[PDB]
Amino acid sequence: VEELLSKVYHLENEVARLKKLMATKDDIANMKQLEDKVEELLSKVYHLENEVARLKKLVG
Amino acid sequence: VEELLSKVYHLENEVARLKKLMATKDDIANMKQLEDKVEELLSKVYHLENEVARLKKLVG
Amino acid sequence: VEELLSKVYHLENEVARLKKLMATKDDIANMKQLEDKVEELLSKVYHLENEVARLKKLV
């Protein structure tokens, strides 16, 4: 019982500490939209590069 | 005591597991930094697309 | 013994709540990939801005 009382006090402290620093699902709720925007940027930059390359040849 | 011993044992395993699997507030800070970079990029790319369109018209 | 079982009961409830609300390392596993792509995008957009400025001047 002396052991079990100390262990519970340890767990209490451990739970409050990890609760303080744990990321929640709410915190990362935006992740899919962030990924989408990176994907959008990859495409738009690719197409911009192609257009700029064509323009660089036309201007000469 | 027989219950406590069993319950505390499982609780310790669960808490250890949570600590290992969890993402943290530091990861959230990093996500927010990335969001800020992406937002800047979206703005820059929009402006670039507008300039390129103007140049395409004027070169033609 | 009874008060310990009470505190353990509350703790089990707290842990179950945390387990359901937890975001995990596997969940954000794509974060480093996005970070790498974004660093490359920053570089590419820098170069695009430079080339567009040069073309604007020329035109």
XYZ file of N, CA and C in Angstrom:
537
model
N 0.842 -1.237 0.000
C 0.000 0.000 0.000
C 0.862 1.265 0.000
N 1.959 1.248 0.754
C 2.918 2.354 0.751
C 3.491 2.585 -0.650
N 3.738 1.495 -1.376
C 4.179 1.574 -2.768
C 3.091 2.179 -3.651
N 1.885 1.626 -3.542
C 0.755 2.015 -4.391
C 0.339 3.478 -4.226
N 0.508 4.030 -3.025
C 0.190 5.439 -2.774
C 1.167 6.358 -3.506
N 2.452 6.010 -3.462
C 3.489 6.773 -4.154
C 3.300 6.717 -5.670
N 3.022 5.519 -6.181
C 2.793 5.305 -7.612
C 1.623 6.125 -8.162
N 0.549 6.240 -7.382
C -0.610 7.043 -7.780
C -0.257 8.532 -7.810
N 0.522 8.985 -6.830
C 1.003 10.368 -6.809
C 1.895 10.660 -8.024
N 2.705 9.678 -8.420
C 3.542 9.798 -9.614
C 2.690 9.909 -10.881
N 1.717 9.008 -11.022
C 0.800 9.020 -12.166
C 0.026 10.332 -12.274
N -0.466 10.834 -11.145
C -1.153 12.126 -11.122
C -0.272 13.210 -11.734
N 0.975 13.275 -11.275
C 1.941 14.246 -11.787
C 2.246 14.035 -13.268
N 2.395 12.774 -13.670
C 2.682 12.433 -15.066
C 1.540 12.799 -16.006
N 0.305 12.584 -15.557
C -0.873 12.896 -16.365
C -1.050 14.406 -16.541
N -0.872 15.164 -15.463
C -0.958 16.625 -15.534
C 0.146 17.224 -16.412
N 1.321 16.595 -16.425
C 2.456 17.100 -17.201
C 2.250 16.853 -18.695
N 1.857 15.632 -19.041
C 1.606 15.287 -20.435
C 0.358 15.995 -20.976
N -0.632 16.221 -20.115
C -1.798 17.029 -20.470
C -1.401 18.462 -20.843
N -0.392 18.991 -20.158
C 0.116 20.328 -20.437
C 0.735 20.413 -21.828
N 1.486 19.386 -22.222
C 2.285 19.476 -23.442
C 1.785 18.637 -24.625
N 0.696 17.888 -24.450
C 0.154 17.064 -25.536
C -0.572 17.910 -26.589
N -0.293 17.642 -27.860
C -1.077 18.226 -28.953
C -2.422 17.501 -29.012
N -3.499 18.242 -29.262
C -4.838 17.660 -29.415
C -5.248 17.592 -30.880
N -6.272 16.798 -31.165
C -6.818 16.713 -32.521
C -7.312 18.075 -32.986
N -7.850 18.864 -32.063
C -8.282 20.222 -32.376
C -7.109 21.097 -32.836
N -5.961 20.961 -32.171
C -4.742 21.691 -32.556
C -4.303 21.433 -33.995
N -4.451 20.200 -34.466
C -4.007 19.842 -35.818
C -5.146 19.759 -36.827
N -6.315 20.264 -36.449
C -7.488 20.203 -37.323
C -7.235 20.828 -38.703
N -6.359 21.837 -38.773
C -6.044 22.542 -40.030
C -5.075 21.797 -40.947
N -4.501 20.693 -40.473
C -3.422 20.022 -41.200
C -3.776 19.652 -42.630
N -4.987 19.151 -42.865
C -5.354 18.760 -44.226
C -5.437 19.963 -45.149
N -5.936 21.092 -44.639
C -5.975 22.287 -45.465
C -4.585 22.840 -45.726
N -3.696 22.726 -44.744
C -2.307 23.154 -44.920
C -1.646 22.312 -46.024
N -1.836 20.993 -45.957
C -1.323 20.098 -46.986
C -1.849 20.479 -48.362
N -3.150 20.749 -48.442
C -3.781 21.171 -49.689
C -3.139 22.425 -50.278
N -2.809 23.381 -49.409
C -2.216 24.620 -49.876
C -0.790 24.418 -50.375
N -0.039 23.538 -49.724
C 1.298 23.200 -50.220
C 1.182 22.553 -51.602
N 0.232 21.640 -51.751
C -0.016 20.999 -53.039
C -0.400 22.023 -54.127
N -1.286 22.962 -53.796
C -1.643 24.056 -54.698
C -0.414 24.868 -55.132
N 0.430 25.195 -54.162
C 1.641 25.973 -54.423
C 2.608 25.239 -55.357
N 2.771 23.936 -55.152
C 3.654 23.113 -55.991
C 3.206 23.182 -57.450
N 1.902 23.027 -57.676
C 1.334 23.128 -59.021
C 1.468 24.527 -59.621
N 1.056 25.548 -58.870
C 1.094 26.930 -59.376
C 2.526 27.374 -59.697
N 3.474 26.997 -58.856
C 4.884 27.365 -59.093
C 5.438 26.655 -60.325
N 5.077 25.385 -60.490
C 5.468 24.624 -61.673
C 4.976 25.315 -62.955
N 3.695 25.674 -62.985
C 3.111 26.345 -64.151
C 3.686 27.745 -64.367
N 3.957 28.451 -63.287
C 4.627 29.756 -63.388
C 6.019 29.635 -63.982
N 6.782 28.647 -63.525
C 8.116 28.378 -64.077
C 8.071 28.133 -65.582
N 7.068 27.378 -66.025
C 6.906 27.084 -67.437
C 6.597 28.341 -68.221
N 5.738 29.197 -67.679
C 5.347 30.434 -68.360
C 6.529 31.403 -68.441
N 7.267 31.509 -67.344
C 8.418 32.417 -67.277
C 9.504 31.948 -68.251
N 9.728 30.639 -68.325
C 10.679 30.080 -69.315
C 10.295 30.446 -70.751
N 9.016 30.328 -71.087
C 8.544 30.738 -72.418
C 8.744 32.228 -72.645
N 8.448 33.034 -71.626
C 8.604 34.482 -71.743
C 10.063 34.879 -71.932
N 10.953 34.233 -71.187
C 12.394 34.478 -71.297
C 12.907 34.221 -72.717
N 12.336 33.228 -73.400
C 12.707 32.957 -74.793
C 12.138 33.985 -75.772
N 10.905 34.430 -75.535
C 10.265 35.436 -76.385
C 10.907 36.815 -76.276
N 11.274 37.213 -75.062
C 11.962 38.486 -74.853
C 13.393 38.420 -75.400
N 14.089 37.322 -75.119
C 15.433 37.092 -75.651
C 16.478 38.027 -75.073
N -6.590 -4.017 -2.747
C -5.141 -3.971 -3.118
C -4.849 -4.795 -4.380
N -5.482 -5.962 -4.498
C -5.360 -6.792 -5.701
C -5.844 -6.044 -6.945
N -6.924 -5.280 -6.789
C -7.452 -4.450 -7.870
C -6.493 -3.308 -8.178
N -6.122 -2.556 -7.141
C -5.201 -1.424 -7.277
C -3.933 -1.804 -8.028
N -3.306 -2.894 -7.593
C -2.085 -3.404 -8.218
C -2.280 -3.599 -9.720
N -3.410 -4.196 -10.091
C -3.725 -4.472 -11.489
C -4.026 -3.177 -12.255
N -4.867 -2.326 -11.669
C -5.274 -1.062 -12.291
C -4.115 -0.080 -12.470
N -3.275 0.045 -11.446
C -2.091 0.907 -11.512
C -1.116 0.412 -12.582
N -0.937 -0.905 -12.661
C -0.060 -1.498 -13.672
C -0.517 -1.129 -15.085
N -1.808 -1.305 -15.357
C -2.371 -0.975 -16.668
C -2.301 0.525 -16.940
N -2.632 1.332 -15.934
C -2.525 2.789 -16.035
C -1.120 3.249 -16.401
N -0.111 2.651 -15.773
C 1.284 2.984 -16.071
C 1.631 2.675 -17.523
N 1.191 1.511 -17.997
C 1.394 1.118 -19.389
C 0.699 2.069 -20.353
N -0.525 2.465 -20.019
C -1.293 3.392 -20.854
C -0.624 4.758 -20.942
N -0.199 5.279 -19.792
C 0.450 6.590 -19.721
C 1.798 6.593 -20.443
N 2.571 5.528 -20.260
C 3.827 5.359 -20.984
C 3.584 5.350 -22.495
N 2.520 4.663 -22.904
C 2.121 4.571 -24.305
C 1.743 5.947 -24.862
N 0.935 6.699 -24.113
C 0.540 8.054 -24.519
C 1.755 8.948 -24.732
N 2.685 8.898 -23.785
C 3.900 9.703 -23.842
C 4.727 9.412 -25.096
N 4.737 8.153 -25.522
C 5.524 7.722 -26.675
C 4.869 8.113 -28.002
N 3.547 7.978 -28.075
C 2.806 8.196 -29.316
C 2.471 9.654 -29.601
N 2.330 10.466 -28.554
C 1.776 11.812 -28.713
C 2.672 12.777 -29.475
N 2.027 13.665 -30.221
C 2.658 14.873 -30.713
C 2.553 15.894 -29.588
N 3.326 16.972 -29.673
C 3.395 17.949 -28.584
C 3.113 19.380 -29.049
N 3.034 20.299 -28.086
C 2.840 21.725 -28.384
C 3.975 22.326 -29.226
N 5.178 21.775 -29.095
C 6.301 22.147 -29.951
C 6.003 21.807 -31.411
N 5.365 20.668 -31.650
C 4.952 20.314 -33.017
C 3.902 21.280 -33.544
N 3.012 21.729 -32.666
C 2.001 22.712 -33.043
C 2.646 24.048 -33.391
N 3.624 24.477 -32.597
C 4.381 25.701 -32.903
C 5.027 25.614 -34.281
N 5.626 24.460 -34.588
C 6.220 24.231 -35.910
C 5.189 24.257 -37.040
N 4.000 23.704 -36.792
C 2.903 23.736 -37.760
C 2.471 25.174 -38.046
N 2.355 25.969 -36.997
C 2.005 27.378 -37.149
C 3.075 28.163 -37.929
N 4.344 27.853 -37.698
C 5.410 28.484 -38.460
C 5.241 28.143 -39.945
N 4.906 26.888 -40.218
C 4.717 26.449 -41.593
C 3.527 27.142 -42.224
N 2.426 27.258 -41.481
C 1.264 27.992 -41.964
C 1.626 29.418 -42.369
N 2.402 30.094 -41.532
C 2.813 31.476 -41.820
C 3.636 31.554 -43.120
N 4.558 30.610 -43.295
C 5.334 30.521 -44.540
C 4.472 30.262 -45.757
N 3.505 29.363 -45.620
C 2.595 29.047 -46.730
C 1.729 30.243 -47.109
N 1.228 30.962 -46.112
C 0.432 32.152 -46.380
C 1.230 33.224 -47.128
N 2.470 33.452 -46.716
C 3.362 34.358 -47.457
C 3.558 33.883 -48.904
N 3.753 32.579 -49.085
C 3.980 32.033 -50.426
C 2.765 32.196 -51.334
N 1.578 31.912 -50.801
C 0.337 32.085 -51.550
C 0.213 33.521 -52.075
N 0.517 34.497 -51.215
C 0.464 35.909 -51.598
C 1.479 36.212 -52.697
N 2.705 35.750 -52.496
C 3.766 36.001 -53.468
C 3.417 35.408 -54.833
N 2.886 34.186 -54.830
C 2.549 33.483 -56.065
C 1.375 34.150 -56.794
N 0.372 34.593 -56.039
C -0.724 35.338 -56.626
C -0.200 36.580 -57.333
N 0.660 37.334 -56.656
C 1.230 38.548 -57.255
C 2.064 38.230 -58.497
N 2.831 37.153 -58.421
C 3.647 36.721 -59.562
C 2.792 36.331 -60.772
N 1.712 35.601 -60.526
C 0.797 35.215 -61.590
C 0.230 36.464 -62.254
N -0.113 37.464 -61.454
C -0.641 38.710 -62.004
C 0.365 39.444 -62.864
N 1.617 39.499 -62.413
C 2.671 40.135 -63.189
C 2.980 39.386 -64.476
N 3.020 38.065 -64.399
C 3.316 37.273 -65.582
C 2.218 37.461 -66.631
N 0.956 37.412 -66.205
C -0.170 37.672 -67.111
C -0.034 39.016 -67.830
N 0.326 40.071 -67.090
C 0.559 41.387 -67.680
C 1.712 41.345 -68.696
N 2.803 40.671 -68.342
C 3.938 40.535 -69.258
C 3.585 39.734 -70.512
N 2.791 38.679 -70.356
C 2.376 37.872 -71.514
C 1.594 38.708 -72.517
N 0.687 39.527 -72.000
C -0.124 40.415 -72.832
C 0.742 41.436 -73.576
N 1.669 42.050 -72.847
C 2.526 43.103 -73.386
C 3.581 42.588 -74.369
N 4.018 41.342 -74.194
C 4.997 40.731 -75.098
C 4.326 40.317 -76.410
N 3.093 39.822 -76.322
C 2.325 39.424 -77.500
C 1.972 40.591 -78.406
N -6.817 2.543 0.891
C -7.105 1.544 -0.183
C -8.340 1.946 -0.990
N -9.391 2.371 -0.293
C -10.621 2.828 -0.938
C -10.422 4.183 -1.619
N -9.712 5.090 -0.949
C -9.424 6.413 -1.509
C -8.472 6.323 -2.704
N -7.576 5.337 -2.686
C -6.688 5.079 -3.823
C -7.479 4.596 -5.037
N -8.405 3.666 -4.808
C -9.288 3.161 -5.862
C -10.155 4.272 -6.454
N -10.516 5.248 -5.622
C -11.259 6.421 -6.071
C -10.401 7.296 -6.984
N -9.177 7.588 -6.547
C -8.241 8.401 -7.332
C -7.826 7.713 -8.632
N -7.659 6.393 -8.578
C -7.330 5.600 -9.764
C -8.488 5.614 -10.767
N -9.716 5.568 -10.255
C -10.919 5.646 -11.085
C -10.975 6.977 -11.839
N -10.780 8.078 -11.113
C -10.676 9.408 -11.722
C -9.532 9.483 -12.736
N -8.384 8.902 -12.387
C -7.222 8.872 -13.285
C -7.498 8.106 -14.575
N -8.160 6.956 -14.456
C -8.541 6.158 -15.629
C -9.460 6.945 -16.565
N -10.388 7.702 -15.984
C -11.290 8.556 -16.757
C -10.527 9.665 -17.463
N -9.588 10.277 -16.744
C -8.752 11.341 -17.292
C -7.900 10.829 -18.453
N -7.275 9.669 -18.267
C -6.432 9.063 -19.302
C -7.265 8.686 -20.533
N -8.467 8.150 -20.320
C -9.354 7.784 -21.431
C -9.740 9.010 -22.256
N -9.975 10.122 -21.566
C -10.274 11.388 -22.221
C -9.068 11.846 -23.046
N -7.881 11.810 -22.443
C -6.650 12.230 -23.126
C -6.370 11.384 -24.361
N -6.566 10.077 -24.218
C -6.408 9.107 -25.305
C -7.261 9.456 -26.532
N -8.480 9.927 -26.289
C -9.419 10.270 -27.357
C -9.091 11.624 -27.998
N -8.560 12.543 -27.194
C -8.220 13.896 -27.645
C -6.799 14.015 -28.206
N -5.911 13.104 -27.806
C -4.519 13.065 -28.281
C -4.370 13.189 -29.793
N -3.474 14.078 -30.220
C -2.896 14.021 -31.557
C -1.580 13.257 -31.433
N -1.252 12.449 -32.438
C -0.115 11.530 -32.361
C 0.978 11.856 -33.369
N 2.153 11.275 -33.155
C 3.277 11.411 -34.079
C 2.932 10.910 -35.486
N 2.232 9.780 -35.573
C 1.793 9.259 -36.873
C 0.835 10.233 -37.571
N -0.064 10.861 -36.815
C -0.981 11.867 -37.385
C -0.258 13.004 -38.113
N 0.771 13.554 -37.480
C 1.520 14.677 -38.058
C 2.740 14.204 -38.831
N 2.761 12.930 -39.227
C 3.946 12.328 -39.831
C 4.350 13.016 -41.123
N 3.392 13.665 -41.784
C 3.648 14.342 -43.054
C 4.220 15.749 -42.890
N 4.329 16.222 -41.649
C 4.782 17.580 -41.361
C 6.176 17.865 -41.893
N 7.114 16.948 -41.667
C 8.492 17.130 -42.136
C 8.548 17.177 -43.662
N 7.715 16.365 -44.312
C 7.616 16.365 -45.760
C 7.152 17.736 -46.267
N 6.145 18.292 -45.614
C 5.633 19.614 -45.988
C 6.672 20.686 -45.750
N 7.356 20.605 -44.616
C 8.434 21.542 -44.320
C 9.492 21.542 -45.417
N 9.894 20.358 -45.876
C 10.897 20.252 -46.939
C 10.405 20.851 -48.262
N 9.162 20.557 -48.629
C 8.580 21.114 -49.842
C 8.487 22.626 -49.777
N 8.132 23.148 -48.608
C 7.976 24.584 -48.448
C 9.331 25.286 -48.548
N 10.392 24.694 -48.007
C 11.730 25.300 -48.167
C 12.102 25.395 -49.641
N 11.806 24.343 -50.404
C 12.051 24.359 -51.836
C 11.206 25.405 -52.555
N 9.930 25.513 -52.183
C 9.042 26.523 -52.735
C 9.530 27.945 -52.490
N 10.053 28.204 -51.294
C 10.591 29.522 -50.960
C 11.708 29.869 -51.931
N 12.595 28.907 -52.169
C 13.717 29.099 -53.084
C 13.239 29.349 -54.512
N 12.295 28.527 -54.963
C 11.757 28.654 -56.325
C 11.064 29.988 -56.571
N 10.324 30.447 -55.574
C 9.587 31.690 -55.682
C 10.571 32.876 -55.667
N 11.594 32.797 -54.828
C 12.707 33.759 -54.896
C 13.261 33.901 -56.314
N 13.579 32.776 -56.944
C 14.150 32.792 -58.283
C 13.147 33.325 -59.321
N 11.879 32.934 -59.189
C 10.835 33.447 -60.074
C 10.698 34.962 -59.987
N 10.666 35.488 -58.771
C 10.570 36.935 -58.558
C 11.719 37.645 -59.244
N 12.934 37.124 -59.068
C 14.113 37.701 -59.714
C 14.001 37.719 -61.250
N 13.575 36.596 -61.831
C 13.457 36.486 -63.301
C 12.333 37.379 -63.843
N 11.209 37.404 -63.145
C 10.102 38.283 -63.533
C 10.521 39.757 -63.462
N 11.216 40.149 -62.392
C 11.706 41.536 -62.289
C 12.607 41.904 -63.477
N 13.484 40.977 -63.853
C 14.387 41.160 -64.977
C 13.617 41.282 -66.290
N 12.623 40.418 -66.496
C 11.775 40.512 -67.688
C 10.944 41.801 -67.718
N 10.441 42.219 -66.561
C 9.675 43.458 -66.480
C 10.531 44.624 -66.929
N 11.783 44.637 -66.480
C 12.705 45.701 -66.843
C 12.948 45.699 -68.348
N 13.199 44.513 -68.893
C 13.460 44.347 -70.325
C 12.276 44.729 -71.208
N 11.068 44.382 -70.777
C 9.863 44.718 -71.524
C 9.489 46.175 -71.262
